[PDB]
Amino acid sequence: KGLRQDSNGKLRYFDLTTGIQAKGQFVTIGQETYYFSKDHGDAQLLPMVTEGHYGTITAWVYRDQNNTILKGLQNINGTLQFFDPYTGEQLKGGVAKYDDKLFYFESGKGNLVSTVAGDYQDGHYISQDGQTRYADKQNQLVKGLVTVNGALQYFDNATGNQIKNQQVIVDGKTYYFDDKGNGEYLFTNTLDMSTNAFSTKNVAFNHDSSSFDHTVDGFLTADTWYRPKSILANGTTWRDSTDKDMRPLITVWWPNKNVQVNYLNFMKANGLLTTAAQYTLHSDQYDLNQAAQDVQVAIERRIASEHGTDWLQKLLFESQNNNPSFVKQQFIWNKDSEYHGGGDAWFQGGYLKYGNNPLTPTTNSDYRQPGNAFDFLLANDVDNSNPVVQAENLNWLHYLMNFGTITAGQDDANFDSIRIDAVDFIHNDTIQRTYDYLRDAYQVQQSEAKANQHISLVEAGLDAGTSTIHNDALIESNLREAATLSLTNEPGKNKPLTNMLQDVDGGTLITDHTQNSTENQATPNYSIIHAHDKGVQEKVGAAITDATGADWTNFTDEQLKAGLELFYKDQRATNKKYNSYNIPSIYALMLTNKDTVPRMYYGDMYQDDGQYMANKSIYYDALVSLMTARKSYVSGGQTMSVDNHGLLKSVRFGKDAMTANDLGTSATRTEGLGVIIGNDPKLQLNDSDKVTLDMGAAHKNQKYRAVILTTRDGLATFNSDQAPTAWTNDQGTLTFSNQEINGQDNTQIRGVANPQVSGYLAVWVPVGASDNQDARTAATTTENHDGKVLHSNAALDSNLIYEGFSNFQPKATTHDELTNVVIAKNADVFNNWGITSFEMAPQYRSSGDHTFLDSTIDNGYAFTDRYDLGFNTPTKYGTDGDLRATIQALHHANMQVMADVVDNQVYNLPGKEVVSATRAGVYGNDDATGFGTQLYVTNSVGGGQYQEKYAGQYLEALKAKYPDLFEGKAYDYWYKNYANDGSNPYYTLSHGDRESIPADVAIKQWSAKYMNGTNVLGNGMGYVLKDWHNGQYFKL
């Protein structure tokens, strides 16, 4: 019966539905909020506070009309809040005492949402019958919803067992308790539905799909409209519904009390309810339900006047006044309930991992195992463990490796080799099976002659254990990381150059430079300093954010232009804020070190403030001189040491001389070279000190000339013997000092700071090379017996890879500026530098969707249709015709051409499905968050025209030609183990067994059953509608 006076005139409250008296609680009645005492249940009016503003102190506070700071409990704008009785500081995510009871104030807005049974500081946790429990000061188990050392926690009432990683309903409120048992309020549940005659008319007409819309896979969403049994025409006259009548579900049913309350308040604010009544989480459910029915009256009147429901679509489901829509204002329907971020959420706010549910047969999977160290990274994660997907990956690989043959009958327009993008993020079985395809197709395992015609690489170091077990592909050396410790930093911030003497990945030796006189011992590797991503994309990103405020993954053509201006001006200065120091030095190491394939980065030679190859960097001439000299001179053994002045001294002996005492051939005399590098721009030698290079026994009493000398303003570069000269002594030693040699400028050793060097750099070669001297070693057809595909020897070291793009290239404004056009035109330039393998950008059409950097600058890594390499309209790089022509031109200039194989993910799939989801990080690890595990509407279905045309088209032919690829197979791989006690990671030999795969199922469009998961989409934990009282999903 509601608010009732007793025989002494005091007010008491009885629940309008149950008749149960309110004691120790707050209730909003009409306009007022009261507290009812826990003893007799007597009313205390809590005065509505209306004027005032939320402020701060040197901590939120609230200030009244006089600007005074409020203390204790306060009824502000239909919520109850608590402010410290002295500080005035607002309580958020904690308890306060009132009427000698504990009430909890939630962490988002500090609103009173519940009662807590007790507050504990002085007990202790115990473990008991395999659970965690908490004992009070009397050693008595504590039960229920409590705070403990300030954390909200829950102990099962029957047993005392602590609840961890669960959503729990307690006294009609829903909370989540994390992996440590620490809790947060989520929402207040509705009590129960109006079961009146009015409500029975609002019931769905039937459970057919025709009666509901904005559904996905038979599930309802927050957007769903439905056909009720009856309609209250114009607010007054019930009639049967027709097939044309639809109303929003959310005008009649709410997932929780917060949304129902917000709904009433929103509708009142938009003129659909005339009342002074206040609607709060302490309103009686009966009154909330009646109010919603009165709103319907006003809704139906406006439907009659307007002859339609479009106004109502806009009112609830679109932004009005640049506010989010009503739906998006609600916690359970926006990203707040998805708990984005965390240390393992590397991109896009983190991830949702797909699982199974009896209600989702079409999105369930028996697979989804990561089969590698990482799992998620970007967009829609492909499930490379699924056998159908493994076959598709073979199909696509075949396509790329025969691209010209397939698309135009042009057999000289095919890719020769691959890069495996994000190799550690895809299942090992698909990597292994890929390598078998290359063995089948090209017989790479047979000899270095075959392997070296198809030099592939992966985006990882020694961690890529399927690529290192049989060295099927190059892995990245540690040069980049080492150089980032000792060379790239500003003065005062580099470590000593002694870290350059050995190439070590987490304590495992890749190669030792100090006295390297052997062959086929090092792990075949590539060496870099920069790539399109590595050491670049976040520094440009930082200049873009500084010059314009834009976020590094999402900006305009015009903000980028501004960032790039600042970036190149900084690149060209001695004192650099965004740019690496000592870039030519690092290249000198890359280009002279033994047992590596160097990879040149396009962006180190050319600037993105111009079109492709238009603007040379400040480093261009030094890098050309080094590539030139490498081709002419670099061969034989190596030595490396760091002297007492901190200088790194590196020598290559020349062809066929492996040690400093070998003579080699008469060819050796004019081969070999020496490099001196320092990282101390203030280096000064005294007048007696010498710096020596021990050129070896083939090089006694010999004239040498400079390739590179350090100058005051830069670097002097020489591509002929017309250069400053110096002589070895009768031991083959070159000697330098703080004086010029024969008065020649820049032949002395001293530290310098200028835009190209911070420390010292000089490179010296023997005088007298013939015109077209070439120090490189051809591969042989000698059969391999050791089980390895690649071998680190003079023939492999003779290769040179060029990464032929940057992320930040501008869009081409003419056909002639298109990357693919310009590459083709300049093919001979790359051949003359000694490039043997041209690594082209990923050629796939960009999704364009701006959800990551890759789909904002359209680099080819973010795509929807992996078969579309520029058909009809060009990619960023050209059309399919331009690509064929590029691959041909490169092939005619004696290069192989590398396909960037991107198996990890697909972007921007428009068709929606419902899948079970949990929050996860890059490792594929479940995150313990308030989202829990929920059915989720995913953007998972699509592909495009070329996928439809080509996917699966090759598999029956492939299985006829290479049946081994479709079988199961046992294999071995190296596995990287981490130690807990701080010592180095160590490798163990793991065994795998890939499954057999079918040839007769095509993936003509992607769908969720072939995916592991998705980046978070912001729909909310409760966008797919269910009964939150029992967890039961609505389904048609």
Ligand SMILES: OC[C@H]1O[C@H](OC[C@H]2O[C@H](OC[C@H]3O[C@H](O)[C@H](O)[C@@H](O)[C@@H]3O)[C@H](O)[C@@H](O)[C@@H]2O)[C@H](O)[C@@H](O)[C@@H]1O
């Ligand atoms: O002028 C200050 C403030 O006024 C409105 O918001 C009122 C709001 O203020 C506090 O909390 C707001 C905000 O604080 C943290 O960021 C929370 O985590 C957020 O979820 C929360 O929205 C106060 O404690 C609340 O009780 C009160 O309702 C404006 O809307 C604010 O944006 C503005 O900053």
Ligand SMILES: OC[C@H]1O[C@H](O)[C@H](O)[C@@H](O)[C@@H]1O
């Ligand atoms: O504080 C120490 C921890 O002890 C136990 O491990 C409990 O699970 C946890 O709630 C508590 O935080």
Ligand SMILES: [Ca+2]
């Ligand atoms: Ca993956």
Ligand code: NA
């Ligand atoms: Na090929």
